Amino acid sequence: GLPVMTTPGSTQFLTSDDFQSPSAMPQFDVTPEMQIPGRVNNLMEIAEVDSVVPVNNTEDNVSSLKAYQIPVQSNSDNGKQVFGFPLQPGANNVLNRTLLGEILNYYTHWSGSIKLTFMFCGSAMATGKFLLAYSPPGAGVPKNRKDAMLGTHVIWDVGLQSSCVLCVPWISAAGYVTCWYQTNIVVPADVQSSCDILCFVSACNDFSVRMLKDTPFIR
Amino acid sequence: GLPVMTTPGSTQFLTSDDFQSPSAMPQFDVTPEMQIPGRVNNLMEIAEVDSVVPVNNTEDNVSSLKAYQIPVQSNSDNGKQVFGFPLQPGANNVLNRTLLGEILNYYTHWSGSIKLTFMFCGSAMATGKFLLAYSPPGAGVPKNRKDAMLGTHVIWDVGLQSSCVLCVPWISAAGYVTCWYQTNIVVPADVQSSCDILCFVSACNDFSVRMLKDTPFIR
Amino acid sequence: GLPVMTTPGSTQFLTSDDFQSPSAMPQFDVTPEMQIPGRVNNLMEIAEVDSVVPVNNTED
Amino acid sequence: SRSESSIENFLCRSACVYYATYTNNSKKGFAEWVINTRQVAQLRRKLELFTYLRFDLELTFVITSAQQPSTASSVDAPVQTHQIMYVPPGGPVPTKVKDYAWQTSTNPSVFWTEGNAPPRMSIPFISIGNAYSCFYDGWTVYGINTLNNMGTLYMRHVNEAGQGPIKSTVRIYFKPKHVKAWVPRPPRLCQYEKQKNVNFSPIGVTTSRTDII
Amino acid sequence: SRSESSIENFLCRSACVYYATYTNNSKKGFAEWVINTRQVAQLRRKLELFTYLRFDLELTFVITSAQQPSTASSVDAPVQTHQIMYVPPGGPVPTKVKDYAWQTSTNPSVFWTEGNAPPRMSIPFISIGNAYSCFYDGWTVYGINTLNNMGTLYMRHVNEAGQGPIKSTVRIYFKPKHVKAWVPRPPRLCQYEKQKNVNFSPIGVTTSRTDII
Amino acid sequence: RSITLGNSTITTQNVVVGYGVWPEYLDQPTQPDVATCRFYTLESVQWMKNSAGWWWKLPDALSQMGLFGQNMQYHYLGRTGYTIHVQCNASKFHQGCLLVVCVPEAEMGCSNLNNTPEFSELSGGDSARMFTDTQVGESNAKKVQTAVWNAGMGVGVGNLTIFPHQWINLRTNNSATLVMPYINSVPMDNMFRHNNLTLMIIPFVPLNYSEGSSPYVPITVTIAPMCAEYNGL
Amino acid sequence: NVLTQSPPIMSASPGEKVTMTCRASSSVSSSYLHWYQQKSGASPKLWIYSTSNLASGVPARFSGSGSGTSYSLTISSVEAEDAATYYCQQFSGYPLTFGAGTKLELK
């Protein structure tokens, strides 16, 4: 017949191949398609949406809806820390179980930038100001309001707008996203002073993942 | 199906083949290139550079930097040998561990020509003359300055230039590269008389190697 | 894959075949030719020359 | 590098889903596996990121053998042959090793002799609805959805026992092909209890730390 | 003749790099090899003529077998099957013969039955930096460079032990393919002590002679 | 003659450039180019009679050096080319010969055969480390083996001419000049854990002089960074 | 790397030739083997360096030899004033080990 010659690696099962296969059920006349809404072509479209960050863990709020709420009250000392969390990946941080951080646990190397949106869910009559400090990797965490101001920051006037966006990069000291009281919460009579803040996280649309592995969130 | 017919030498592993192979990791999206300087396309570019020849072995200079230096002093007898070394390959010669001779030990047959550069690292006020004799394969080693002059040679005036080039062929009595005092080293007052010479070797750009084997410099 | 079907006389060694063979030494860069005089293309050129006949055997 | 995060590169990966043994002379040795995606917990968590899936199917069987301890006197065996029968949804089902439903003409089976390449077979999108459904909020028993039924597989020897027992294991490999996915969904936080359902026991949202600052 | 001295003709040659044994019933028999170029001293001295290398990888496994001394009564065995699992850099690693990490879906493995052509597989340039680095003057421990990590390979039988022990050896062959090289470097004069590092003890420059003339 | 960079000025009268290529520029890396681009003259070493050699690890000798050292603690990453001016100044009555060679990725070897050297021993910051012409013993734990005929890397020291180099022969020459491009596998690396160049100066022919002349000769190294840029915001 | 000298005690009349040897455990290079001489109640003195070269101020009756792992020292004519102890030093790695000592008494 036609002379052929079989090479090494012939009658083997390599589990990561792509070969044609004999169909078990021919002549079946498979069901046609249908336009169902909401098609996913890529996993980066799942990561681009906003998700609430459980930034208030504290070992008794994790089995509650209190894990998402940052307490803000009108204290008596000017200049204090509201919250603060590092950007160190994987070692039990707070962006881990979120909807962005569930995709980045399926890969080993990823690198890009992050939107962080904060929303002040207090009264409509309450006013104040906040600092939103970001420390770059290498610079230490600020210990005063003053040297937090000397770095990069956003001053967030609550009475003007109720939402402030801060975009940082996140790569696989690595960073800090602390936030500070600039002024107190001034409130009228017959309005409550204990207000809360919610924090949303997203993907800033321009980044990449390599070398898929399996997630550490399993037995 | 299609009638085929397998020939002898089919399901064998010949270690020197070139066959297509099934990739273990597809869909990986390999890292792209990058312009790194200093690309090697051939091993003859490694051989074309100049390297110092340890021409002063003498069984106690080999664990030193003295192995590279040829002693030159102002003696009292006119006509003497400075150095001399055969061009017989492999049998413990001095061009063996050099950067040219490390490539020619990976092959069995090689044949071409050799640049040999000498450099007089003495004072700027010292003068003299040297003969640079080359004996061809078949002719004996010269035993006088006179019959060394009657062959092929270069007279190297040190006071004019401090570098003299001599090009010989080297094929896998086979040759000699002896060198002789023509005149003494004339030196002024308050200048040292013990000067040294360094010797560089290279490839003269036009030669070929065949039948790669493994080097004898291993356990 | 592509469906094939092996016929009789497949994995045999017939000593008078002509098949392609995998080279043991590739990348060797074989020595080129050279014009040597006196090439033989056929054995009938050996037979066309004259040779002396031992026609006087006689056992001694 | 955004081609590693596509839907095909995320889900078209091979995975061992089942592992069963069967011996030829013991009259209750034959394997059986109802094809479901909820078998291995790592693949299940990936397919449950989407509500509706649609894919072809490709299965490969790694069948090995072992010689069981017989009595004596020179057990010699020829090469063994196995049968891997695939029952479509709504087909007759065997219940013994010598049964009629092995011989039915609508259940396609492969026959494979030991010592060759493993027996791959391929199954198209076999359903009446236009997509497989991972979640189903309703009754047919709550949350079953009898429309995404993919069939069953059955394994046995075809040689009679000659002199000594021989038991064999099988590992089934699973590979979704040409995947389309719709309506993304948040990934599971709690652990998996039972295969059939979504039942769970509550757990905290995330691992905790000592102070907020 | 200058095509024998090219970089591809110098380095794209096959070389046996590893040799390990493993037996099926002894519960501590399975092979393991972390892929490094510093295994055999003759290939290492050739790859250390250059600072940065970049190549594809091609591996071939010559697996044989041997019948260990069993007790008695007619050991008969079917054809054996082995599994060769490749763990990428940063993957889960087995530690026993019955472990979960053999069954993971991201570690591609080949299954090969004895008596066929040997099991070749091919591995691309798997790194994040743009070149493998033979030398690294820095810390991550001094001079390690965790970026040129190529993975690990693991071998085992897949058949259970039937009547008698069987031990198997494996020889791994190594062939760089489509090689690019940068920044040449002088060849080593001293001998090799440890695999990890460049540590040495000093030796003379060359072999000596009696007199200079 | 009398070239200047920023607020410094050195003077020169033969240059050898790298692997043939000239250094040039490339989240987003920012370009600081005027503030630290100047000539950083390190202190002089003394070439005596029985001297053996010197070395400097190159993105570490400029770590305590002024605003260049301030730009390193503020930045995680960076990529930099260099320009090295080496001159020694002796009379016409001295004699010697130096090899000025610039080695990329020079792994040193420890004296103990199991361990690895330490950071205080591998590189003195803006200060020259010395080769020796004896052996460093095996008894001390973490020290660099500096047998100069092996150049600390286990190799023939005569074959060090394959790196970009220059000879300084006192009879004919006075200085050397090197222009070294950025050589690395990654395009931008950790600058705190990697010393990607090493500048070695080895006297092949030793210094000699008659009685009366100055008994040692100074050597002066000057480094000027070319096309430096870092990563951060 | 230890050195054994033999014989430990050596006696010979003046005017004859006598020799001693110093055999190393491993290979020592020919340039790193030296010979010393220590009289009774005095410091040692360097006698022969690098196995063949006489030191300064030493008489010409001595000549060292040997290579590899076996080295020796020969006295062509024995006088009366050169009765002392002779040690051999080596260097293969650190430390620098000495011999055991060979004592020469005249007869």
Side-chain angles (χ1 to χ4, degrees):
Chain A
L2 192 91
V4 302
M5 180 196 321
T6 78
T7 50
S10 66
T11 75
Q12 61 167 3
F13 178 42
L14 174 65
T15 71
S16 43
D17 53 24
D18 197 28
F19 286 141
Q20 295 258 332
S21 58
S23 181
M25 298 204 61
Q27 67 215 355
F28 178 54
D29 215 28
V30 74
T31 313
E33 308 268 348
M34 176 190 163
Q35 304 270 11
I36 320 184
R39 192 162 176 183
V40 198
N41 290 284
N42 202 303
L43 292 194
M44 279 300 116
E45 314 174 0
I46 299 180
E48 75 178 9
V49 309
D50 300 87
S51 315
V52 197
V53 170
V55 71
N56 193 12
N57 314 139
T58 67
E59 293 176 350
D60 48 11
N61 304 353
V62 286
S63 87
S64 176
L65 267 178
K66 204 85 177 70
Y68 303 106
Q69 309 163 24
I70 322 173
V72 166
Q73 67 260 13
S74 90
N75 44 6
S76 157
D77 34 11
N78 197 303
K80 260 182 66 177
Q81 209 176 8
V82 178
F83 63 94
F85 61 98
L87 292 179
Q88 180 69 35
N92 58 89
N93 58 350
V94 303
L95 310 191
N96 209 9
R97 311 304 304 252
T98 180
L99 195 54
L100 170 63
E102 285 273 3
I103 297 174
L104 310 178
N105 280 132
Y106 276 120
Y107 295 98
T108 67
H109 291 117
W110 39 267
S111 90
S113 48
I114 297 305
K115 284 175 69 178
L116 274 161
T117 318
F118 303 94
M119 185 169 64
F120 182 77
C121 307
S123 183
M125 303 271 196
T127 44
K129 272 189 207 300
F130 291 107
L131 267 173
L132 275 173
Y134 162 62
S135 317
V141 55
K143 59 178 70 176
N144 287 321
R145 190 214 58 98
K146 181 195 177 186
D147 53 350
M149 193 266 301
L150 300 180
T152 174
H153 59 105
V154 189
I155 302 186
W156 180 23
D157 198 351
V158 160
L160 296 202
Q161 58 192 354
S162 40
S163 42
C164 173
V165 186
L166 169 76
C167 178
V168 307
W170 201 27
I171 309 302
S172 188
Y176 278 101
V177 209
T178 81
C179 164
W180 301 83
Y181 283 107
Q182 166 83 7
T183 66
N184 277 336
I185 294 290
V186 175
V187 79
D190 300 320
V191 187
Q192 279 276 341
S193 43
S194 296
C195 300
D196 296 352
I197 305 181
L198 291 180
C199 165
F200 304 99
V201 74
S202 162
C204 209
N205 182 77
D206 52 79
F207 76 106
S208 76
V209 291
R210 289 168 71 162
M211 194 66 67
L212 188 144
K213 63 161 179 75
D214 55 341
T215 172
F217 306 132
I218 217 72
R219 51 97 168 167
Chain B
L2 192 91
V4 302
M5 180 196 321
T6 78
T7 50
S10 66
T11 75
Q12 61 167 3
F13 178 42
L14 174 65
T15 71
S16 43
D17 53 24
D18 197 28
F19 286 141
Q20 295 258 332
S21 58
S23 181
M25 298 204 61
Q27 67 215 355
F28 178 54
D29 215 28
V30 74
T31 313
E33 308 268 348
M34 176 189 163
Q35 304 270 11
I36 320 184
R39 192 162 176 183
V40 198
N41 290 284
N42 202 303
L43 292 194
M44 279 300 116
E45 314 174 0
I46 299 180
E48 75 178 9
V49 309
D50 300 87
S51 315
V52 197
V53 170
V55 71
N56 193 12
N57 314 139
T58 67
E59 293 176 350
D60 48 11
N61 304 353
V62 286
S63 87
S64 176
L65 267 178
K66 204 85 177 70
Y68 303 106
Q69 309 163 24
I70 322 173
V72 166
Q73 67 260 13
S74 90
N75 44 6
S76 157
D77 34 11
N78 197 303
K80 260 182 66 177
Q81 209 176 8
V82 178
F83 63 94
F85 61 98
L87 292 179
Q88 180 69 35
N92 58 89
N93 58 350
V94 303
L95 310 191
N96 209 9
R97 311 304 304 252
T98 180
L99 195 54
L100 170 63
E102 285 273 3
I103 297 174
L104 310 178
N105 280 132
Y106 276 120
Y107 295 98
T108 68
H109 291 117
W110 39 267
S111 90
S113 48
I114 297 305
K115 284 175 69 178
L116 274 161
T117 318
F118 303 94
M119 185 169 64
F120 182 77
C121 307
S123 183
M125 303 271 196
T127 44
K129 272 189 207 300
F130 291 107
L131 267 173
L132 275 173
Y134 162 62
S135 317
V141 55
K143 59 178 70 176
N144 287 321
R145 190 214 58 98
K146 181 195 177 186
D147 53 350
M149 193 266 301
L150 300 180
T152 174
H153 59 105
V154 189
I155 302 186
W156 180 23
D157 198 351
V158 160
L160 296 202
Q161 58 192 354
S162 40
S163 42
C164 173
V165 186
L166 169 76
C167 178
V168 307
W170 201 27
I171 309 302
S172 188
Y176 278 101
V177 209
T178 81
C179 164
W180 301 83
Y181 283 107
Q182 166 83 7
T183 66
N184 277 336
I185 294 290
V186 175
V187 79
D190 300 320
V191 187
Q192 279 276 341
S193 43
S194 296
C195 300
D196 296 352
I197 305 181
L198 291 180
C199 165
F200 304 99
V201 74
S202 162
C204 209
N205 182 77
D206 52 79
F207 76 106
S208 76
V209 291
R210 289 168 71 162
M211 194 66 67
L212 188 144
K213 63 161 179 75
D214 55 341
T215 172
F217 306 132
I218 217 72
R219 51 97 168 167
Chain C
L2 192 91
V4 302
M5 180 196 321
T6 78
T7 50
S10 66
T11 75
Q12 61 167 3
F13 178 42
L14 174 65
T15 71
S16 43
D17 53 24
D18 197 28
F19 286 141
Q20 295 258 332
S21 58
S23 181
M25 298 204 61
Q27 67 215 355
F28 178 54
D29 215 28
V30 74
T31 313
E33 308 268 348
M34 176 189 163
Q35 304 270 11
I36 320 184
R39 192 162 176 183
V40 198
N41 290 284
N42 202 303
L43 292 194
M44 279 300 116
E45 314 174 0
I46 299 180
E48 75 178 9
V49 309
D50 300 87
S51 315
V52 197
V53 170
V55 71
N56 193 12
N57 314 139
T58 67
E59 293 176 350
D60 48 11
Chain D
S1 158
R2 202 182 66 193
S3 195
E4 198 140 16
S5 83
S6 75
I7 296 300
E8 182 85 19
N9 296 285
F10 185 62
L11 286 166
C12 173
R13 309 259 175 157
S14 199
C16 166
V17 285
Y18 194 47
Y19 173 77
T21 87
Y22 56 95
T23 172
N24 49 352
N25 70 322
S26 278
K27 96 181 70 63
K28 50 199 168 299
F30 70 104
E32 159 191 8
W33 183 56
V34 195
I35 304 184
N36 59 333
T37 73
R38 304 164 143 180
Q39 201 62 257
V40 53
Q42 273 268 15
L43 167 64
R44 177 178 178 190
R45 199 193 183 266
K46 303 176 66 193
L47 297 163
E48 289 184 343
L49 302 197
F50 310 98
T51 313
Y52 302 112
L53 282 161
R54 190 192 168 101
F55 49 88
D56 298 333
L57 203 47
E58 191 208 81
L59 293 102
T60 317
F61 303 91
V62 187
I63 309 180
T64 73
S65 199
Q67 181 204 348
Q68 291 291 102
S70 175
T71 77
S73 53
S74 158
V75 170
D76 172 275
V79 280
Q80 304 291 125
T81 310
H82 314 259
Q83 176 178 10
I84 304 137
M85 201 190 48
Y86 166 64
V87 173
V93 163
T95 176
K96 290 158 295 178
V97 186
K98 258 87 191 176
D99 208 51
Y100 154 71
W102 297 95
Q103 273 93 0
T104 177
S105 155
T106 67
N107 290 176
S109 47
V110 309
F111 292 85
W112 170 82
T113 308
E114 272 207 286
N116 290 259
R120 201 193 299 275
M121 81 207 290
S122 174
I123 289 166
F125 174 67
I126 183 177
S127 171
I128 313 294
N130 312 66
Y132 288 128
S133 169
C134 303
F135 296 88
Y136 176 67
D137 192 11
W139 295 260
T140 310
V141 54
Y142 173 62
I144 282 302
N145 190 18
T146 189
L147 219 69
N148 58 11
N149 192 239
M150 310 179 203
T152 324
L153 292 144
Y154 293 89
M155 272 77 71
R156 73 182 182 139
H157 303 92
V158 314
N159 313 98
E160 266 79 353
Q163 280 308 122
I166 279 174
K167 81 162 303 181
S168 303
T169 70
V170 54
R171 305 159 200 250
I172 310 173
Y173 280 83
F174 187 95
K175 181 166 184 283
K177 279 210 308 179
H178 311 142
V179 196
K180 313 171 175 292
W182 292 276
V183 190
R185 180 165 281 265
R188 193 180 181 90
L189 158 78
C190 314
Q191 318 187 171
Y192 281 115
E193 314 263 338
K194 307 267 183 156
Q195 267 75 79
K196 303 179 290 295
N197 50 8
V198 67
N199 280 342
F200 71 104
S201 66
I203 207 172
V205 167
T206 191
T207 77
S208 51
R209 56 178 167 163
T210 304
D211 185 18
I212 175 171
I213 77 165
Chain E
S1 158
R2 202 182 66 193
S3 195
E4 198 140 16
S5 83
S6 75
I7 296 300
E8 182 85 19
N9 296 285
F10 185 61
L11 286 166
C12 173
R13 309 259 175 157
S14 199
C16 166
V17 285
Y18 194 47
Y19 173 77
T21 87
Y22 56 95
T23 172
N24 49 352
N25 70 322
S26 278
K27 96 181 70 63
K28 50 199 168 299
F30 70 104
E32 159 191 8
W33 183 56
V34 195
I35 304 184
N36 59 333
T37 73
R38 304 164 143 180
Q39 201 62 257
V40 53
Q42 273 268 15
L43 167 64
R44 177 178 178 190
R45 199 193 183 266
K46 303 176 66 193
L47 297 163
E48 289 184 343
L49 302 197
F50 310 98
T51 313
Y52 302 112
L53 282 161
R54 190 192 168 101
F55 49 88
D56 298 333
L57 203 47
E58 191 208 81
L59 293 102
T60 317
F61 303 91
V62 187
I63 309 180
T64 73
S65 199
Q67 181 204 348
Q68 291 291 102
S70 175
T71 77
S73 53
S74 158
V75 170
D76 172 275
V79 280
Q80 304 291 125
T81 310
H82 314 259
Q83 176 178 10
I84 304 137
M85 201 190 48
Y86 166 64
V87 173
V93 163
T95 176
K96 290 158 295 178
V97 186
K98 258 87 191 176
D99 208 51
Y100 154 71
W102 297 95
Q103 273 93 0
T104 177
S105 155
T106 67
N107 290 176
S109 47
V110 309
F111 292 85
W112 170 82
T113 308
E114 272 207 286
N116 290 259
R120 201 193 299 275
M121 81 207 290
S122 174
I123 289 166
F125 174 67
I126 183 177
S127 171
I128 313 294
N130 312 66
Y132 288 128
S133 169
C134 303
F135 296 88
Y136 176 67
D137 192 11
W139 295 260
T140 310
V141 54
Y142 173 62
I144 282 302
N145 190 18
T146 189
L147 219 69
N148 58 11
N149 192 239
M150 310 179 203
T152 324
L153 292 144
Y154 293 89
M155 272 77 71
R156 73 182 182 139
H157 303 92
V158 314
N159 313 98
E160 266 79 353
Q163 280 308 122
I166 279 174
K167 81 162 303 181
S168 303
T169 70
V170 54
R171 305 159 200 250
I172 310 173
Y173 280 83
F174 187 95
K175 181 166 184 283
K177 279 210 308 179
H178 311 142
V179 196
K180 313 171 175 292
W182 292 276
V183 190
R185 180 165 281 265
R188 193 180 181 90
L189 158 78
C190 314
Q191 318 187 171
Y192 281 115
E193 314 263 338
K194 307 267 183 156
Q195 267 75 79
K196 303 179 290 295
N197 50 8
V198 67
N199 280 342
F200 71 104
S201 66
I203 207 172
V205 167
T206 191
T207 77
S208 51
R209 56 178 167 163
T210 304
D211 185 18
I212 175 171
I213 77 165
Chain F
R1 313 210 57 98
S2 278
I3 199 153
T4 173
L5 280 175
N7 50 276
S8 51
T9 296
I10 72 166
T11 180
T12 321
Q13 68 98 4
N14 192 28
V15 70
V16 44
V17 45
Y19 285 96
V21 295
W22 201 269
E24 84 300 333
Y25 302 92
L26 281 169
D27 45 338
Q28 180 41 46
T30 315
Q31 200 187 241
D33 38 7
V34 186
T36 58
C37 204
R38 49 191 292 278
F39 289 107
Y40 287 84
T41 295
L42 324 169
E43 68 169 342
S44 300
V45 304
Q46 301 186 331
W47 184 9
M48 313 174 206
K49 253 192 180 190
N50 310 297
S51 181
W54 301 273
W55 78 85
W56 295 265
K57 303 274 188 173
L58 207 39
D60 183 34
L62 313 178
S63 83
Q64 289 83 348
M65 287 290 105
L67 189 79
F68 204 84
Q70 309 213 350
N71 275 29
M72 295 315 113
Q73 305 214 311
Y74 281 41
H75 307 79
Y76 195 85
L77 296 192
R79 39 167 298 145
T80 316
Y82 294 117
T83 297
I84 305 164
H85 286 101
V86 172
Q87 63 152 4
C88 67
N89 44 6
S91 43
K92 272 131 82 182
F93 288 81
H94 292 75
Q95 46 182 249
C97 187
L98 291 166
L99 167 69
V100 185
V101 67
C102 202
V103 180
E105 311 263 23
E107 279 195 0
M108 294 284 161
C110 190
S111 55
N112 195 4
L113 276 305
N114 299 273
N115 303 332
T116 53
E118 49 183 339
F119 178 54
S120 72
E121 186 69 30
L122 274 176
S123 80
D126 59 55
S127 175
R129 285 281 179 276
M130 297 183 188
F131 288 112
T132 57
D133 50 355
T134 53
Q135 290 199 189
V136 189
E138 294 176 353
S139 68
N140 38 14
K142 294 169 73 180
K143 285 192 66 186
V144 179
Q145 174 76 268
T146 55
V148 62
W149 60 93
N150 285 138
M153 315 188 291
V155 79
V157 79
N159 304 336
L160 269 185
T161 69
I162 197 173
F163 300 108
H165 71 305
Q166 182 87 259
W167 288 92
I168 298 180
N169 189 13
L170 288 184
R171 174 195 177 93
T172 167
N173 208 7
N174 199 12
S175 49
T177 309
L178 300 171
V179 178
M180 295 286 303
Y182 181 68
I183 322 178
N184 210 347
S185 56
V186 298
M188 169 157 265
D189 64 326
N190 195 298
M191 289 199 65
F192 287 101
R193 301 247 186 126
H194 194 195
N195 306 308
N196 46 2
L197 270 73
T198 297
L199 171 77
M200 296 180 174
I201 297 177
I202 307 170
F204 264 93
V205 176
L207 187 76
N208 216 4
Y209 49 85
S210 43
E211 161 59 60
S213 314
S214 315
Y216 52 86
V217 164
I219 310 176
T220 292
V221 193
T222 291
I223 315 159
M226 283 305 168
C227 77
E229 45 184 283
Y230 323 110
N231 204 64
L233 270 192
Chain G
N1 200 9
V2 294
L3 296 169
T4 80
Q5 291 190 354
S6 67
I9 297 286
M10 152 196 293
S11 44
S13 63
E16 73 193 62
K17 178 252 289 181
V18 69
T19 186
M20 54 202 72
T21 182
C22 168
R23 195 166 293 109
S25 90
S26 41
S27 177
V28 56
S29 158
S30 68
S31 88
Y32 296 132
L33 193 136
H34 316 281
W35 290 90
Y36 295 86
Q37 170 194 87
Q38 177 178 31
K39 281 183 177 171
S40 179
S43 43
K45 298 176 80 73
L46 178 75
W47 213 245
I48 281 181
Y49 68 97
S50 276
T51 198
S52 299
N53 302 280
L54 263 71
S56 45
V58 62
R61 313 180 294 262
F62 308 93
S63 70
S65 64
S67 303
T69 182
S70 88
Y71 288 83
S72 67
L73 165 73
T74 64
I75 310 190
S76 278
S77 312
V78 173
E79 316 312 298
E81 67 275 7
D82 45 353
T85 321
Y86 297 100
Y87 304 100
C88 47
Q89 195 213 7
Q90 56 98 57
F91 164 69
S92 43
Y94 294 96
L96 323 172
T97 41
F98 287 85
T102 293
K103 176 56 173 322
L104 166 71
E105 177 68 30
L106 79 171
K107 182 176 293 177

